[PDB]
Amino acid sequence: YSHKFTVVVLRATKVTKGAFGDMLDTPDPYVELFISTTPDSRKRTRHFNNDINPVWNETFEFILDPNQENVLEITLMDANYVMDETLGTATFTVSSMKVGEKKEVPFIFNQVTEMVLEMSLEV
Ligand SMILES: [Ca+2]
Ligand SMILES: [Ca+2]
């Protein structure tokens, strides 16, 4: 744990679903931040139900060694009441990047889903 890696889940609007999640009400947004290199990078953001235009913009720091396979395994899911439902996940190997600034990654799922993740690398 010697490399400074900061991530910031910005937004995740136009999150599509259908009638499935609409059973109770409009889709239920909820993020799931997962990584592969740290001891146990299994964090997430518990948002709410009925919402296709949420905004977390939460910056979580992660000082870990980039010697392993730093695979930023994020996952935009749907927070249910029994079992979560993944809608669109993302993966980005940060162990090998051009550290020096932030990173506005445009991650659109399907076609209308839009989720921007701002992560800045440093050491
Ligand atoms: Ca709902
Ligand atoms: Ca749900």
47 near 21, Cβ under 8 Å?
no
Domains in the chain, number: 1
What's the CA gap between 109 and 88, in Å, rounded? 6
Asked if residues 6 and 48 have their Cβ atoms less than 8 Å apart, the reply is no
Question: Angle 33-35-40 (CA atoms, 0-180°, nearest 5)?
Answer: 95
- The answer to whether 40 is a known ligand-binding residue is no
User: Residue 84 C-alpha to ligand 2 middle, in angstroms?
Assistant: 7
Specify whether the CB–CB gap between 53 and 10 falls below 8 A: no
| 3, 41 Cβ separation under 8 angstroms | no
Q: Report every protein residue that has its C-beta within 5 angstroms of ion ligand 1.
A: 24-25, 28, 49-50
* Ligand 1 centroid distance, CA of 99 (Å): 39
User: Method of determination?
Assistant: NMR
Q: Distance between CA atoms of 90 and 72, rounded to whole angstroms? A: 8
Question: Does 65 show up as a binding residue in the annotation?
Answer: no
Q: Which helix (H) or strand (E) holds 61?
A: strand 55-64
How many Cβ atoms sit within 10 Å of the Cβ of residue 56? 16
User: Looking at residue 13, which CATH number applies to its domain?
Assistant: 2.60.40.150
d(CA 17, CA 9): 20
83-103 exposure pattern, b = at least 16 Cβ within 10 A, e = fewer = eeeebbeeebebbeeeeeeeb
Strand order in the sheet with 42-45: 42-45, 29-34, 71-78, 85-93
| Phi, psi values for residue 57, rounded to 5° | 45, 40
Angle at 28 between CA 22 and CA 34, to 5 degrees: 140
Residue from 74, 115, 123, 58 nearest 96 by CA: 123
Domain interval for residue 120: 1-123
Backbone angles phi, psi at 21, to 5 degrees: -70, -20
Q: Looking at the CA of 20, which ligand is closest?
A: 2
Q: In a 3-state reduction of DSSP, which class is residue 99? A: coil
